[PDB]
DNA sequence: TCGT
DNA sequence: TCGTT
DNA sequence: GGCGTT
DNA sequence: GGCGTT
């Protein structure tokens, strides 16, 4: 048997008891190797009471997760109140414990904890008071999280109280988080060891040097969202009061090690120069959701922030307005360490050579985020002069892998016809995203002429008219072309289309024609020497193959094709005819979510290199009508989510090379070894879950091959008899 | 028991044996009232052999459908060959038989048939020869169908042979259809009684008066697709040979009663005036898929077609080209009986005052079809001057500038065009317009009340599948009569993370009754409260009310202000939970609530008390495991309850009892093991629909539920075939009456 | 099947 | 939450 | 106490 | 003879 039923043993002594609806902590059998357990996860069970005996026998337990077990009223889906009781020696009985998560539990005080504890989450609990006695002897504690104990989702009448010097005994505390606690001031006398202090979304409306006293090791400080602009809030929000916030000039001046500072959503119309005196080595500055729209056009403060790597200016928009132009201050020219600049959501209508003048010669600038700005005029040629750009986001505007390569995102804009003069000075560009535009154009080879280095072009969710024979031929390096969800042209009854351009793309490897509703009046034969993968899912190959033999050889000419996706093609039948005229190079064939109630298994002989077959989500009633044929090179077979009620003995036997097999979500009543014969030893994945198994033969088979059966402990389920229906096969 | 198991008795003596996989015709029990059967449907069974005994006891059988029983190789899904044998007195033993369908069966000759036969389908069979002997004594036969016996889907080596005068003995034959038979000429000496003759998609490449000799009663004639233009074909197609077709001037001149004539796909570059001489009654003329693009600009032939009601000129396009303009001949102003003119697929780029000049004064013209033309400039103001237009189709074009039925009202379809911003000057002179379709365009615009100003009579506006920015407070306020507004599938703006939206315009539309905000993905940063005095129905399906209701109490009263709302659709809203909170703050006027395809695994049934006027509740496609946790509450006025496609495994006794007014109940596609009368109590007599199909019912010997379902059999749909066993195996997936 |  | 205040 | 994959 | 809602 598996050792820790009803939970699952994972590698490295990791026990998973998540989502088992347990009312108390399982102590397991004494025959189980309890000392081997280093991690115990009990996420989202119904344990409302913990006891001295619950973890004592787990001699080497290091991580313990009791999250979501007894959620407070506001966080409960049904608003059920919950109070969790904990006996005094519950966690003291585990002197090896290093990581404890008690979040989303209705506890009202901190329990007694062992001196070994390194990490502690008390977030989203009912603890309203922290004090000196609560953290006695916890000298190893590095991380303390207690977010969300007083806000709209987990309310309290007043606020979280952190007693002065309550945490001061925690000598090794580096990370402290106290967000969403209704705090009106920074807690007094925090540990000097802190490098990360997070106080965001409280109402700390004034600051001063004494509020951050003796915190000279501080590397990251988040005091953002403490007096907010609720015109931008998606959640409940109190408006920043008039004449606030009030930050004393010298508030941050003693924080010499500070790398990151978050001042987002603090209703700031300007910055004080004094705040950043002594923060010359600041690397990250978040100024998002403020009112700095005018400040950034004229400020001189970036001359003193020369080490800055990331600068977030996003959603610094003026209420009720967008600007005609937005010209950045000259001082941005001094940010020579700058790698990432976020300018999304400022709202401005024109992007010109003046806009980003100051940034043009910054030697290390890689990312530039200009999305969601209502830009309707964009001079795209400006980006050619930049020395180091890898990513420009101009998505979600009104203009009319690709990791580590120069990529331009123009998705979700109002482009209707592409003109080549758009792309002048962008010959270095390797990836271009034009998805979710409105491009309806008989594209013909004169649209992308300047893009001589382009390897990836995403034109999904457009209305492109595939007709002219030289489409995309002006892109010599083009390797990947996404033309999915351009269905509207293919729904024009009586107006046909031409896909002969595919043959003229000499280095194309990936093509998607997915979800186009291709059903009639189209080229009879696709061809390509280069193409490796074609996604043709979400079309009507059914209708096409019903038009006599017009489309019998539609894929034939893709003579080096390795992957073909024919999922969601309304296919009720699939003949030897059709499979024989697929390219003989084919290794992976996907046929998910078709209408196949029958499949001639002997016809798989015609696909000599087929390794992976996906028939998931069809309506097969059985695995019979001839077995899998001899000499087949098949490795993966997915027949899950069918209605398979029985399997002929010796069905899988002849598939020597078979490795993965998914029989899940079927109508199987048993799991018989005669189906696989010799394959039972060779198989590495045998999914048999979500089947109505008759629980009274199969248990000894599954236990013998238990390493190959995923979710054996919990997911492999009985269908009969009642009393065991829907429950694990090991409940008896 | 139901009388004709395993088939179903329907009203009017109609027995349905379709799709039962029967290898022979069922004779039924002798206790069954065999004489009551007037219609027997056996569609798509596996009956390859018919016998003298099969229908003899059906003394009053009038209709018999044996379609798809033994499909020929080409029509078989797996290309299995099939030959159907028929004993001599199979149909003679039914002397009352009037309607016989033998289509999609591999028969090679016509069987012996009773003299009572009125209608006969031999379409898609293996009959390659019709002859004099085949129709002996069939004097009552009015309809003969035999389409598709020689073409790509049902091939023969040569063609269907119709012997001269083979059908001449059929004295009452009115309708004859012989499409897709590879015929090279009209069959000789057809019956003079014919009013409808259909010969489309053969290869009758020449015609003459003698080909249609003595057919003076002919009302409809289809000779279209007989020499085709395969550049437009979606199916296998042979090109019209050079110098063809060859129609003699006087071919149709003796057909005085002809109302409809189909000359589509005949590769005609012009018409002959002589063809229409003596066609004084001609009401319908189909000229589609020809090469008449130049002919229609200058022809004078429409001066002699003054009785014509429908004229189809669609797909008269010039190969490889579209035209800059298209100016119709002056003679179109002469078609004074014309009601419908179809001009889709000609391909022309500009629509002006000149284009349709000739049509402007035609007094009865209702429909004008200009779709699929690649038009990029359209002067829409021209349509105001027309006296009788009800429908103008300008859909699927390239135009970019200057729900109630709409069937009997002036409607303009501009859907599937390239409009990005709407300018009011588009709609000048269209103040009479009552319905406007702008769906599947690319409209991305902060619409604000200055876009539709001329449309003073507009009641219905479809803006679905666009990218409209709902923000300004006066959107659509310039439409005073606006009753129905579809803003569904405008989701992209609502996916702009951090850019919020404003739906306060809904309150400013004083006569709005229907609104759709469906499939918009509305999830955050939106107006907290919708309001309207007038609104009756709101489709809010396909959004994330789940996310909205998870933001504290911001959207707690989101629907509250719709104070006269009768229908609310909250389907596909990702709702895992549904509290008393949320239902209490819906409008108390609400009568129909739809919650299909949400994520509801639990439902507090007692909270239905808070919706006092609720009559229809749709919870189909959720994940309810049982009907329990309190029963339906007392005084509930509920009439329809749909909890189908859940995982309901049991029902607490007395669950439905308190719902006095309950009429329809859908429990189908669940995990129910029985059907217990204690669930309903007194309701069992009251219920009019009780769907219990696709449930894994436990069919034990003397199972409780069979006597309950039989007692209430009029209320249970698909009882004969669809009500199914789940256990034990050997009965699994089969009928409860096996 | 979209200015040959 | 998009030329206001 | 029930609810739910956050 | 089997397949399949045409
Ligand atoms: C937070 O503090 C305010 C002001 O003292 C108080 O009114 C409110 O009740 C407190 N709690 C919450 C959950 O907002
Ligand atoms: C920006 O582009 C314009 C138009 O080509 C040009 O006149 C101007 O010199 C360019 N540079 C600057 C710094 O304005
Ligand atoms: C695309 O169309 C334009 C306009 O007709 C033409 O000038 C151009 O040569 C075409 N491009 C190609 C590559 O044929
Ligand atoms: C598709 O285009 C190519 C080249 O433009 C042409 O040779 C081919 O015949 C076209 N297809 C059809 C169906 O006309
Ligand atoms: C099954 O496939 C084999 C081999 O391709 C072929 O001989 C046979 O005709 C097929 N049978 C059916 C029923 O389709
Ligand atoms: C139709 O007849 C032609 C010529 O008489 C012949 O070539 C062909 O075999 C027939 N076509 C079909 C589809 O039966
Ligand atoms: C259409 O007209 C009919 C009768 O004239 C009327 O019943 C109906 O209300 C009208 N519908 C619209 C949407 O204008
Ligand atoms: C709508 O917006 C346009 C452009 O900003 C403006 O001209 C017009 O006055 C606005 N309409 C109304 C009704 O205010
Ligand atoms: C929506 O617009 C109305 C009037 O234009 C305004 O009163 C209301 O505050 C707006 N909604 C939001 C969320 O600002
Ligand atoms: C009950 O629901 C099913 C789908 O779940 C549907 O097929 C059926 O039509 C419904 N019953 C009635 C009587 O309409």
Strands (E), A259-393: 260-262, 284-286, 310-312, 340-342, 350-351, 367-369, 377-378, 391-393
Dist. CA B123–CA B178, nearest whole Å: 8
Q: Is A205:A227 a contact under the CB 8 Å cutoff?
A: yes
Dist. CA A436–CA A175, nearest whole Å: 42
Specify the residue for token string 């179809």.
Answer: B342
Q: Is A578 strand, coil or helix?
A: helix
Gaps in chain B (C to N distance exceeding 2.5 A) after:
402
CA distances from B119 to A316, B69, B112, B139, B140 (A): 78, 19, 14, 11, 9
**DSSP character for A337?**
T
Token pair belonging to B35: 């004489």
Cα A204 to chain center, whole Å? 32
User: Which residue owns the Cα nearest ligand 3 atom 7?
Assistant: A446
Residue A543 burial (CB < 10 Å; 0-12/13-18/19+)?
middle
Residues 6+ apart with CB under 8 A from B88: B52, B112
Q: Is B329:B299 a contact under the CB 8 Å cutoff?
A: yes
Dist. CA B339–CA B356, nearest whole Å: 15
* Structural class in CATH, domain A1-732: alpha beta
Q: Is the dihedral of CA B273, B275, B281, B285 positive or negative?
A: negative
Token pair belonging to B258: 């002809």
Residues of A in contact with B500 (CB under 8 A): 232, 234
- Nearest CA-CA partner of A462 in A447, A452, A478: A447
Q: Which residues pair with A70 in a beta bridge?
A: A105
Specify the residue for token string 């349709």.
Answer: B356
CA of B545 to the centre of ligand 6 (A): 62
CA distances from A427 to A230, A433, A448, A453 (A): 43, 15, 10, 6
- Binary contact (B492, A645; C-beta < 8 A): no
User: Counting ligands in written order, which one lies closest to the CA of residue B667?
Assistant: 10
CA of B435 to the centre of ligand 8 (A): 24
CA distances from B96 to A33, A197, B92, B115, B120 (A): 84, 94, 9, 9, 14
Residue contacts between A and B (CB atoms, under 8 Å): 93
Token pair belonging to B689: 């629909």
- Taking CA A592 as the corner, what is the angle to CA A588 and CA A593, rounded to the nearest 5 degrees? 165
C-beta neighbour count of A648 within 10 angstroms: 15
Dist. CA A301–CA A294, nearest whole Å: 13
Q: Which residues pair with B206 in a beta bridge?
A: B246
Parallel, antiparallel, or unpaired: how do β-strands B63-65 and B85-86 relate?
unpaired
Specify the residue for token string 């996003």.
Answer: A314
Dist. CA A551–CA B151, nearest whole Å: 17
Substitution candidate for ligand 1 out of A124, A157, A180, A185 with most atoms within 8 A of CB? A157
Residues 6+ apart with CB under 8 A from A210: none
Q: Is A605 strand, coil or helix?
A: helix
Return the ligand 4 atom nearest residue A469 CA.
5
Out of A235, A416, A494, closest to residue B345 by CB = A494
Q: Which residues pair with B738 in a beta bridge?
A: none
Q: In chain A, which residue's Cα lies nearest the Cα of B444?
A: A414
**DSSP H helices in B502-653:** 545-549, 580-584
A400 in B contact zone (CB under 8 Å): yes
| Cis bond before residue A6 (omega within 30° of 0) | yes
Rg (CA), chain B: 32
Dist. CA B86–CA B92, nearest whole Å: 11
- Binary contact (A372, B498; C-beta < 8 A): yes
Q: Which residues pair with A207 in a beta bridge?
A: A247
Substitution candidate for ligand 8 out of B422, B447, B450 with most atoms within 8 A of CB? B450
A488 in B contact zone (CB under 8 Å): yes
Residues 6+ apart with CB under 8 A from B277: B253, B304
A520 in B contact zone (CB under 8 Å): yes
Token pair belonging to B541: 């399906």
Gaps in chain A (C to N distance exceeding 2.5 A) after:
400, 696
Backbone torsion region of residue A562, taken as left when φ is above 0, otherwise alpha when ψ lies between -120 and 50, otherwise beta: alpha
- Binary contact (B235, A550; C-beta < 8 A): yes
C-beta neighbour count of B66 within 10 angstroms: 26
A547 in B contact zone (CB under 8 Å): yes
Dist. CA A616–CA A614, nearest whole Å: 6
Q: Which residues pair with B436 in a beta bridge?
A: B412, B461
Q: Which nucleotides of F are covered by protein (CB under 7 A)?
A: 1-6
- Binary contact (A520, B732; C-beta < 8 A): no
- Nearest CA-CA partner of B555 in B527, B533, B597: B527
Out of B152, B153, B498, closest to residue A315 by CB = B498
Token pair belonging to B718: 């698909």
User: Which residue owns the Cα nearest ligand 1 atom 6?
Assistant: A158
Token pair belonging to A144: 């303390």
Dist. CA A656–CA A654, nearest whole Å: 6
| Distance in angstroms: CA A526, C1' C1 | 16
The reply to whether A492 sits in an annotated binding site is no
Q: Percent helix, strand, coil in chain B (nearest 5)? A: 10, 15, 70
Q: Is A538 strand, coil or helix?
A: coil
Does the nearest atom of strand D lie within 7 Å of A27's Cβ?
no
Q: Is B614:B605 a contact under the CB 8 Å cutoff?
A: no
Q: Is A41:A12 a contact under the CB 8 Å cutoff?
A: no
Q: Is B642:B619 a contact under the CB 8 Å cutoff?
A: yes
Q: How far apart are the first and last CA of chain B?
A: 12
Q: Looking at chain A, how many residues does it have?
A: 732
Q: Which residues pair with A40 in a beta bridge?
A: A15, A64
- Nearest CA-CA partner of A154 in A210, A86, A108: A108
Residue B691 burial (CB < 10 Å; 0-12/13-18/19+)?
buried
C-beta neighbour count of A88 within 10 angstroms: 10
Q: How far apart are the first and last CA of chain A?
A: 11
Dist. CA B495–CA B469, nearest whole Å: 11
Dist. CA A525–CA A174, nearest whole Å: 65
Dist. CA B659–CA A304, nearest whole Å: 75
Specify the residue for token string 């039924």.
Answer: B28
- Binary contact (B497, A372; C-beta < 8 A): yes
Q: Is B375:B349 a contact under the CB 8 Å cutoff?
A: yes
Token pair belonging to A524: 């009879």
| Cis bond before residue A721 (omega within 30° of 0) | yes
Dist. CA B477–CA B461, nearest whole Å: 13
**DSSP character for A175?**
E
User: Which residue owns the Cα nearest ligand 7 atom 13?
Assistant: B406
- Nearest CA-CA partner of A650 in A631, A624, A632: A624
| Distance in angstroms: CA B466, C1' D4 | 29
Q: Is B286 strand, coil or helix?
A: strand
- Where do the domains of chain B lie? 1-738
Does the nearest atom of strand D lie within 7 Å of A158's Cβ?
no
Dist. CA A701–CA A200, nearest whole Å: 55
Q: Is A189:A162 a contact under the CB 8 Å cutoff?
A: no
Q: Is B589:B563 a contact under the CB 8 Å cutoff?
A: yes
CA distances from A137 to A117, A132, A141, A573 (A): 10, 11, 9, 72
Dist. CA A71–CA A79, nearest whole Å: 9
The CATH code belonging to domain B1-738 is 3.80.10.10
Find the helix or strand (DSSP H, E) in which B145 lies: strand B143-145
Return the ligand 8 atom nearest residue B448 CA.
1
Q: In chain B, which residue's Cα lies nearest the Cα of A600?
A: B78
B658 in A contact zone (CB under 8 Å): no
Strands (E), B160-252: 161-162, 175-177, 196-198, 206-207, 220-222, 246-247
CA distances from B325 to B352, B379, B576 (A): 8, 12, 57
Strands (E), B313-360: 340-342, 350-351
CA dihedral B30, B31, B34, B39 (to 10 degrees): -110
Q: Is B120 strand, coil or helix?
A: strand
Q: Is B659:B639 a contact under the CB 8 Å cutoff?
A: no
- Binary contact (B499, A372; C-beta < 8 A): yes
Dist. CA B695–CA B666, nearest whole Å: 11
Q: Give A135's Cβ-side CA count (13 Å radius).
A: 28
B79 in A contact zone (CB under 8 Å): yes
**DSSP character for A408?**
E
């Amino acid at each position: 048997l598996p050792a820790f039923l009803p939970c699952e043993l994972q590698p490295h002594g990791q026990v998973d008891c998540n989502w088992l609806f347990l009312k108390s902590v399982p102590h397991f059998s004494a025959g189980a190797p309890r000392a081997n357990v280093t991690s115990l996860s009990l996420i989202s069970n119904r344990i409302h009471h913990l006891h001295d005996s619950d973890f004592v026998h787990l001699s080497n337990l290091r991580v313990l997760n009791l999250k979501w077990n007894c959620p407070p009223a506001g966080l409960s889906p049904m608003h059920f109140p919950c109070r969790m009781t904990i006996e005094p020696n519950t966690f003291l009985a585990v002197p090896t414990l290093e990581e404890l998560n008690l979040s989303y539990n209705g506890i009202t005080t901190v329990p007694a904890l062992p001196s070994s504890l390194v990490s502690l989450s008390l977030s989203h609990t009912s603890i309203l008071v922290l004090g000196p006695t609560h953290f006695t002897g916890l000298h190893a504690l590095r991380f303390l999280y207690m977010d969300g104990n007083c806000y709209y989702m987990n309310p309290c009448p007043r606020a979280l109280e952190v007693a002065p010097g309550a945490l001061l005994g925690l000598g090794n505390l580096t990370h402290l988080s106290l967000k969403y606690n209704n705090l009106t001031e920074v807690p007094r006398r925090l540990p000097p060891s802190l490098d990360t202090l997070l106080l965001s979304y409280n109402h700390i409306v004034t600051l001063a040097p004494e509020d951050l006293a003796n915190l000279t090791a501080l590397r990251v400080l988040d005091v953002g969202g403490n007096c907010r602009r609720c015109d931008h809030a998606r959640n409940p929000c109190r408006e920043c009061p008039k004449n606030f916030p009030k930050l004393h000039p010298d508030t941050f001046s003693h924080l010499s090690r500070l790398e990151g500072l978050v001042l987002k959503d603090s209703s700031l119309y300007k910055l004080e120069k004094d705040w950043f005196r002594g923060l010359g080595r600041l690397q990250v500055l978040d100024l998002s959701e403020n009112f700095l729209y005018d400040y950034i056009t004229k400020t001189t403060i970036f001359n003193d922030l020369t080490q800055l790597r990331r600068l977030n200016l996003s959603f610094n928009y003026h209420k009720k307005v967008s600007f005609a132009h937005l010209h950045l201050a000259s001082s941005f020219g001094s940010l020579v360490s700058l790698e990432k600049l976020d300018m999304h959501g400022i709202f401005f209508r024109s992007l010109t050579n003046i806009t980003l003048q100051s940034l043009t010669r910054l030697p290390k600038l890689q990312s530039l985020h200009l999305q969601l700005n209502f830009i309707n005029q964009a001079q795209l040629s400006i980006f050619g002069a930049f020395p180091s750009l890898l990513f420009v986001d101009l998505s979600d505007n009104r203009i009319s892998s690709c990791n580590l390569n120069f990529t331009l995102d123009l998705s979700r804009n109002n482009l209707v016809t592409i003109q080549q003069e758009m792309f002048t000075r962008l010959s270095r560009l390797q990836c271009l995203r034009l998805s979710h535009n409105s491009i309806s154009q008989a594209v013909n080879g004169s649209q992308f002429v300047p893009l001589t280095s382009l390897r990836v072009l995403d034109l999904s969710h457009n209305k492109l008219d595939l007709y002219h024979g030289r489409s995309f031929t002006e892109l010599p390096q083009l390797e990947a072309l996404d033309l999915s969800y351009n269905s509207q042209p293919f729904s024009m009854q009586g107006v046909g289309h031409n896909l002969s351009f595919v043959a003229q793309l000499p280095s194309l490897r990936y093509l998607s024609l997915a979800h186009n509703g291709i059903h009639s009046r189209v080229s009879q034969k696709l061809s390509s020497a280069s193409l490796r993968a074609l996604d043709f899912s979400g079309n009507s190959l059914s209708q096409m193959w019903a038009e006599g033999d017009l489309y019998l050889c539609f894929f034939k000419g893709l003579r080096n094709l390795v992957q073909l996706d024919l999922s969601e093609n309304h296919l009720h039948t699939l003949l030897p005819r059709h499979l024989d005229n697929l390219p003989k190079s084919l290794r992976q064939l996907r046929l998910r979510d078709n209408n196949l109630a029958f499949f001639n298994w002997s016809s798989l002989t015609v696909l000599p290199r087929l390794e992976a077959l996906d028939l998931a989500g069809n309506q097969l009633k059985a695995l019979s009508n001839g077995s899998l044929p001899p000499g087949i090179r098949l490795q993966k077979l997915d027949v899950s989510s069918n209605s398979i009620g029985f399997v002929i003995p010796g069905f899988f036997v002849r598939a020597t090379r078979l490795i993965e097999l998914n029989l899940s979500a079927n109508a199987l009543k048993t799991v018989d070894p005669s189906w696989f014969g010799s394959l039972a030893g060779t198989l590495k994945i045998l999914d048999v879950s979500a089947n109505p198994l008759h629980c009274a033969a199969f248990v000894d088979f599954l236990l013998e091959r238990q390493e190959a059966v995923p979710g054996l402990s919990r997911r492999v389920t009985c269908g009969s008899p009642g009393q065991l229906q829907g429950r694990s096969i090991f409940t008896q």
